[PDB]
Curated annotation (Swiss-Prot), chain B:
Main location: virion
Cell location: Virion; Host nucleus
Highest taxon of source: Viruses
Family: Belongs to the herpesviridae TRX1 protein family.
Name of the protein this chain belongs to: Triplex capsid protein 1
GO CC term (a single one): host cell nucleus
UniProt record, GO biological process: viral capsid assembly
Keywords associated with the record: Capsid protein, Host nucleus, Virion
Function description: Structural component of the T=16 icosahedral capsid. The capsid is composed of pentamers and hexamers of major capsid protein/MCP, which are linked together by heterotrimers called triplexes. These triplexes are formed by a single molecule of triplex protein 1/TRX1 and two copies of triplex protein 2/TRX2. Additionally, TRX1 is required for efficient transport of TRX2 to the nucleus, which is the site of capsid assembly.
Gene for this chain: TRX1
Annotated TM spans: none
Subunit structure: Interacts with TRX2, MCP and capsid vertex component 2/CVC2.
UniProtKB/Swiss-Prot annotation, chain C:
Subunit note: Homomultimer. Makes the hexons and eleven out of twelve pentons. Interacts with triplex proteins 1/TRX1 and 2/TRX2; adjacent capsomers are linked together in groups of three by triplexes, heterotrimeric complexes composed of one molecule of TRX1 and two molecules of TRX2. Interacts with scaffold protein; this interaction allows efficient MCP transport to the host nucleus. Interacts with capsid vertex component 2/CVC2. Interacts with the small capsomere-interacting protein/SCP.
Species per Swiss-Prot/TrEMBL record: Epstein-Barr virus (strain B95-8)
Record function comment: Self-assembles to form an icosahedral capsid with a T=16 symmetry, about 200 nm in diameter, and consisting of 150 hexons and 12 pentons (total of 162 capsomers). Hexons form the edges and faces of the capsid and are each composed of six MCP molecules. In contrast, one penton is found at each of the 12 vertices. Eleven of the pentons are MCP pentamers, while the last vertex is occupied by the portal complex.
Protein name: Major capsid protein
Family: Belongs to the herpesviridae major capsid protein family.
Gene: MCP
Subcellular location, record wording: Virion; Host nucleus
Taxonomic superkingdom: Viruses
From Swiss-Prot, chain D:
Subcellular location: Virion; Host nucleus
Protein name as annotated: Triplex capsid protein 1
Family indicated by similarity: Belongs to the herpesviridae TRX1 protein family.
GO MF annotations, alphabetized: DNA binding
Any one of the GO BP annotations: viral capsid assembly
Function: Structural component of the T=16 icosahedral capsid. The capsid is composed of pentamers and hexamers of major capsid protein/MCP, which are linked together by heterotrimers called triplexes. These triplexes are formed by a single molecule of triplex protein 1/TRX1 and two copies of triplex protein 2/TRX2. Additionally, TRX1 is required for efficient transport of TRX2 to the nucleus, which is the site of capsid assembly.
Keywords for this protein: Capsid protein, Host nucleus, Virion
Quaternary context: Interacts with TRX2, MCP and capsid vertex component 2/CVC2.
Gene name of this polypeptide: TRX1
Lineage: Viruses, Duplodnaviria, Heunggongvirae, Peploviricota, Herviviricetes
This protein's GO CC annotations: host cell nucleus; viral capsid
From Swiss-Prot, chain E:
Record-annotated disulphide pairs: none
Principal location: virion
GO MF: structural molecule activity
Similarity remark: Belongs to the herpesviridae TRX2 protein family.
Record-level GO cellular component terms: host cell nucleus; viral capsid
Database matches in InterPro entries: Herpes_capsid_2
Annotated protein name in UniProt: Triplex capsid protein 2
Subunit structure: Interacts with TRX1 and major capisd protein/MCP.
Encoding gene, per UniProt annotation: TRX2
Keywords associated with the record: Capsid protein, Host nucleus, Virion
Organism: Epstein-Barr virus (strain B95-8) (HHV-4)
Function comment: Structural component of the T=16 icosahedral capsid. The capsid is composed of pentamers and hexamers of major capsid protein/MCP, which are linked together by heterotrimers called triplexes. These triplexes are formed by a single molecule of triplex protein 1/TRX1 and two copies of triplex protein 2/TRX2. Additionally, TRX1 is required for efficient transport of TRX2 to the nucleus, which is the site of capsid assembly.
Entry-linked Pfam families: Herpes_V23
């Protein structure tokens, strides 16, 4: 409760760590390579639960 | 154009007229702003009437009204006791 | 080996082949065992196939 | 085992007839069996209809099937069986997902950007994800190369349900029939306002069969999909649809620039399959939870998809 | 039905020949039984000039065959019928991926004779297999070898108008479904190129004769450089020009129909085969 984020470069709405791993910007990517960050950055996977 | 909104309230008529003036206080300003009551008959802003009493615990269960290809959402008052009254103006 | 002003929260997904234990209580489901009926696949020259 | 033996023994090819030319007494009883086989395989009795089920393995051909791996949000569970599906060509080599389209989800790829539209947007309410399936619709229809990136894969015969990463099975070539051996006919369902009969617009020889042609066509507002039913051939229906496409040759005239090669092609025609001409297409009505659209029902389909040929 | 066709090998095959025939066992090849004219190897021999059009007409005339088994004296192969299907594989050294394409074209191998062949030292014949390739790749390599033959013979006659690297930068690579291939561009393909050339030279007077056959509607759509030819030409010369042009147009149209066009359903990239029928 004493801070909002431990890093502001990936936990924002559109940030560096978010545009690298969200599936809304990864449209020109190869869809076969596995992304461990997809479970933490893709919004629908983070929201469907 | 005129409107027909159906209000469900648990309080009496003396309370429903005061809370209806409170609910429609922005619309009185809107009707006074967009047109001007240059005549004396444009002063009245609607009128309400009691349509009847139903139970407060199980009332207004929502349902649907399915016509041929479209369906609008409908609210379904069960165990209704119809007792209509004359119109009470809102101003 | 000099710091670039930037740290790296590195993440990694690591798989584990676990040996599970399934406990299903008595009379939980009800199977309905139908009867087997046969068909015909590509019946070639060397063999007929069902 | 007794049920299995009684089921296999009935579903068995009959043995071939022998004529021992060498021996004397064996030839007589073998031709006796030959005439006793013909006389009960030709006359009006139940014996001559009992003979037709053995199939004697040229006439019957088990078809091929296309196991396609699709996303569940790009499809709908509530569709009918005989929907002609259209696979989209994928640019990435290792993709794993073959993006197919039912004619309604492809109708919302048509209209979103500009009856059928009611049931279409009732079946596929959010079109942003389906516009995100295709990487480029407007540019690919601008250079008019959309017809070759869309390939038809025949009508759906089996849709096994799954909440994520659905799997469908279509007959790509051959007689259209279901996959489960409890046997039923897969009736091809085509929505009627996209379906036109070519004798109706034509307004003398009886064929063997009446084929069904899909024609992705490039109208100036957007693409258009029309299912053409013709008793004629492919190179004949190219000429007949050249007669039918009367204002298109006026539009390609009135876009007078010839170096802009986009308006010099007007769609392409692909032959879907062959249903019988003696039994015409039946009209029907397909119902959702609220709406009902009239749908052409086509039975006894033999699917064989051909190439897109340019009008 | 009984479809197993055998061919008569005179000499027994050695071990490397067995390996090279096993390497491309899944591919198709034409048919004339004689092992001498067994395939396309009599057009690609050193006996004749490697002319494209006679090779295409022989490939569209005679039947095809996909082979199943190889032995030291026999070649088990089934010929093609319009009725049923055969499982064929892509075993060609110019490798083109059959990912999801519903059509396969059978053309003579324009990527060099050595690229798709087996040379039999012990026997009397050196066999070749035609190119079985998806049809946008087929029409693209037809474009990029036809225009390269034209733009090469032009700079052999006059190198002042075009550039060889400018045509070799684009006309040497095909790009279908994200795969980027390179074309072995070295004679070959000259008669088809000159046929196309004769067609597009005589097509102005052809279009003028056709629009004069039946007015300013079809005369507006030519541009001013595409309209003006003078109205003085002999009757016999014009008739022979029109007849030879329409003959080459019909042959060139049936030639740019890419021959026996195969169709596939289920390409399995793990085992590199697809269920293939004749269409």
């Amino acid at each position: 409760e004493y801070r909002s984020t431990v890093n502001p470069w990936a936990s924002q709405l559109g940030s560096l760590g978010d545009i690298m791993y969200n599936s809304s910007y990864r449209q020109t990517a190869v869809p076969g390579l596995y992304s461990p960050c997809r479970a933490f950055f893709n919004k629908e996977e983070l929201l469907r639960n | 154009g005129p409107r027909f909104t159906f209000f469900q309230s648990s309080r009496g008529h003396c309370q429903i007229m005061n809370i209806l003036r409170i609910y429609y206080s922005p619309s009185i300003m809107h009707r006074y702003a967009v047109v001007q009551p240059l005549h004396i008959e444009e002063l009245t802003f609607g009128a309400v009437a009691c349509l009847g009493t139903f139970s407060a615990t199980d009332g207004w269960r929502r349902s649907a009204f399915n016509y041929r290809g479209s369906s609008l959402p409908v609210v379904e008052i069960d165990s209704f006791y119809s007792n209509v009254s004359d119109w009470e103006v809102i101003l | 080996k000099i710091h670039p002003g930037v740290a790296m929260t590195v993440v990694r997904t690591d798989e584990i082949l676990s040996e599970n234990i399934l406990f299903s209580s008595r009379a939980s489901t009800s199977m309905f065992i139908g009867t087997p009926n046969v068909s015909r696949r590509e019946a070639r020259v060397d063999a007929v196939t069902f | 085992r007794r049920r299995l033996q009684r089921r296999i023994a009935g579903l068995l090819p009959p043995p071939a007839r022998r004529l021992n030319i060498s021996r004397g007494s064996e030839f007589t009883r073998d031709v006796r069996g030959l005439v006793e086989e013909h006389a009960q395989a030709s006359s009006l009795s139940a014996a001559a209809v009992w003979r037709a089920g053995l199939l004697a393995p040229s006439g019957w051909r088990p078809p091929v099937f296309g196991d396609f791996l699709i996303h569940a949000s790009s499809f709908n569970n509530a569709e009918a069986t005989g929907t002609p599906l259209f696979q989209f060509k994928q640019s990435d080599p290792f993709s794993g997902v073959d993006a197919v389209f039912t004619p309604l989800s492809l109708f919302i790829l048509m209209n979103h950007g500009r009856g059928l539209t009611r049931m279409a947007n009732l079946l596929y309410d959010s079109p942003a994800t389906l516009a995100d399936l295709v990487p480029d619709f407007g540019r690919l229809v601008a250079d008019r190369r959309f017809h070759n990136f869309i390939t038809p894969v025949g009508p759906l015969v089996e849709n096994i349900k799954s909440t994520y990463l659905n799997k469908i099975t279509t007959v790509v070539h051959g007689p259209v029939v279901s996959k489960a051996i409890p046997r039923s006919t897969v009736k091809v369902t085509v929505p009627q306002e996209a379906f036109v009969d070519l004798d109706a617009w034509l307004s003398q020889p009886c064929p063997a069969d009446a084929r069904l042609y899909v024609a992705l066509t490039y109208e100036e507002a957007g693409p258009r999909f029309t299912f053409f039913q013709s008793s004629r051939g492919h190179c004949q229906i190219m000429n007949i649809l050249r007669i039918y496409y009367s204002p298109s040759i006026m539009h390609r005239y009135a876009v007078v620039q010839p170096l802009h090669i986009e308006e010099l092609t007007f769609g392409a025609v692909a032959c879907l399959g062959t249903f019988s001409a003696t039994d015409g297409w039946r009209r029907s009505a397909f119902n959702y939870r609220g709406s009902s659209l009239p749908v052409v029902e086509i039975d006894s389909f033999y699917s064989n998809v051909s190439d897109w040929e340019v009008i | 039905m009984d479809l197993k066709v055998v061919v008569s090998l005179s000499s027994r095959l050695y071990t490397d020949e067995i390996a090279k025939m096993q390497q491309r066992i899944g591919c198709i090849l034409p048919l004339a039984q004689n092992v001498q004219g067994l395939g396309l190897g009599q057009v690609y021999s050193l006996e004749t000039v490697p002319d494209y059009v006679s090779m295409y007409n022989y490939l569209s005339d005679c039947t095809l065959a996909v082979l199943d088994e190889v032995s030291v004296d026999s070649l088990i192969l089934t010929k093609i019928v319009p009725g049923q299907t055969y499982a064929i594989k892509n075993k060609y050294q110019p490798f083109f991926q059959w990912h999801g394409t519903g059509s396969l074209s059978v053309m003579p191998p324009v990527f060099g004779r050595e690229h798709a062949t087996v040379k039999l030292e012990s026997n009397d014949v050196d066999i070749v297999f035609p190119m079985v390739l998806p049809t946008p790749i087929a029409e693209e390599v037809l474009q990029k070898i036809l225009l390269f033959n034209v733009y090469s013979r032009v700079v052999m006659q006059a190198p002042g108008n075009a550039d060889m690297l400018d045509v070799h930068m684009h006309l040497g690579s095909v790009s279908y479904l994200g795969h980027h291939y390179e074309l072995a561009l070295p004679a070959l393909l000259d008669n088809l190129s000159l046929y196309f050339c004769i067609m597009v030279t005589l097509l102005p007077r052809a279009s003028m004769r056709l629009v004069r056959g039946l007015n300013l509607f079809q005369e507006m759509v030519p541009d001013e450089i595409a309209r003006i030819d003078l109205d003085d030409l002999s009757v016999a010369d014009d008739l022979s020009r029109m007849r030879v042009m329409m003959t080459y147009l019909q042959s060139l149209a049936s030639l740019f129909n890419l021959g026996p066009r195969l169709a596939t359903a289920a390409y399995s990239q793990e085992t590199l085969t697809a269920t293939c029928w004749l269409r």
